[PDB]
Amino acid sequence: SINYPNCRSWHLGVETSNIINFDTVPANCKAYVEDYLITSKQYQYDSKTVNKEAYFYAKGLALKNDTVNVWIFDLDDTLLSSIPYYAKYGYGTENTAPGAYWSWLESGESTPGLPETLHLYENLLELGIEPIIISDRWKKLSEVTVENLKAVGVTKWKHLILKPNGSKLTQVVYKSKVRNSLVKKGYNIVGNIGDQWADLVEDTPGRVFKLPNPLYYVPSL
Amino acid sequence: GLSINYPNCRSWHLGVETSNIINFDTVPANCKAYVEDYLITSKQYQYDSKTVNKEAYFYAKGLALKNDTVNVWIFDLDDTLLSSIPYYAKYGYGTENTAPGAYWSWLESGESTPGLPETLHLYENLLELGIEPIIISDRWKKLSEVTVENLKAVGVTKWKHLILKPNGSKLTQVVYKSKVRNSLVKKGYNIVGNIGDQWADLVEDTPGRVFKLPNPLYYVPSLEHHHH
Ligand SMILES: [Mg+2]
Ligand SMILES: [Mg+2]
């Protein structure tokens, strides 16, 4: 229905949540997305600036020794990249069947790490902030997820939380349930990083950081 | 005072638009060329603004609005309907410190702020849908006459209310705007949309979908709306 004559303008719209609920990347934006994500290195530069901002904030906090100080991480497209998968399917311009990405993950296919986020993850551990990784992947994918994290140098976390098999919950509601259970256990959430605004609903404490993602959209509240 | 290093200006700008970067004091000195290029040379500002106003309009078109309900859309003024660019172009495009009051003094003298045509198109289209615009501005009341003149000059005339800030008020912009919006709710108005160039304009403590216009020039402190 809406034409997006300028692909950079569309992309800013999606990053700011001015444009929501897109099922696919606009066809005319395929080359922009590929060039953004790979050739131009703008995705890398954008990612580095976000992670650096998170770190400068994190290293200014006065952490108390008597509480569990935590930082929430998303997994897909925050720590691990789905780019090799999307690259085969037209960088988000094509429809993909639900469950297909998961099947791909089950096939022995590893995902590359996102090194700017991995640097942040390592920095937070050094500051004594405890990462909690919350993922919408089904619990059946636990072993393959742990293997992939190990392959990118992530082996320590306070919790790695996956979604109950065949859960009926939307991603936004499931992640809100998890964060609220964390608060309830007395954890002090100081920050939250993810590539979807759905990951970053401000219903629990901590500063939020939105990693770029032009490939796809997860509905929010 | 404390500098912060941003070797990629575009990454910096995306950070400020998303609110990953907040409360910057001035534009990074190395990003002067970028901002001038973004706002004027490249026309990217225009294309970005067009996209935002277009989504807003297609959203508004899709609402089922009752005739008997006062259905309103909130507009910001500066860098939403009227542009501060001619002022900032004098001061390194946000890279230099400007005394507080300096901008208001510049407006008071009757300096022109050009219209932002993409927002003006949205404003006109909303009137056609029977949605009544309300303009909420942090400009002091004493700027009411120059404000009305600059609005008339760019083709804006029918608003339900034009609300300026009490002279000398000690409220922050975010708090003042929230108090105004909340009073509109109490009046029984139905806010269906809200558009502005600062997150401070767009706190979701009152109803309506929010749309954030681009602005690399400055940052207005904001507050997060606690969800349940
Ligand atoms: Mg993700
Ligand atoms: Mg403004």
Author numbering:
A (entry chain B): 51 to 271
B (entry chain A): 49 to 276
From the paper:
Arabidopsis thaliana vegetative storage proteins, VSP1 and VSP2, are acid phosphatases and belong to the haloacid dehalogenase (HAD) superfamily. In addition to their potential nutrient storage function, they were thought to be involved in plant defense and flower development. The acid phosphatase activities of these two enzymes require divalent metal such as magnesium ion.
VSP1 crystallized in space group C2 with two monomers per asymmetric unit. The size and location of the cap domain suggests that VSP1 belongs to the classical C1 cap type of the HAD superfamily. Based on the sequence alignment and structure comparison, the four conserved aspartate residues in VSP1 are Asp124, 126, 245 and 249. Recombinant VSP1 is a dimeric enzyme in solution based on the result of gel filtration chromatography, and this was further confirmed by X-ray crystallography. In VSP1 structure, the intersubunit surface is located away from the active site and seems not involved in the stability of catalytic site and substrate recognition.
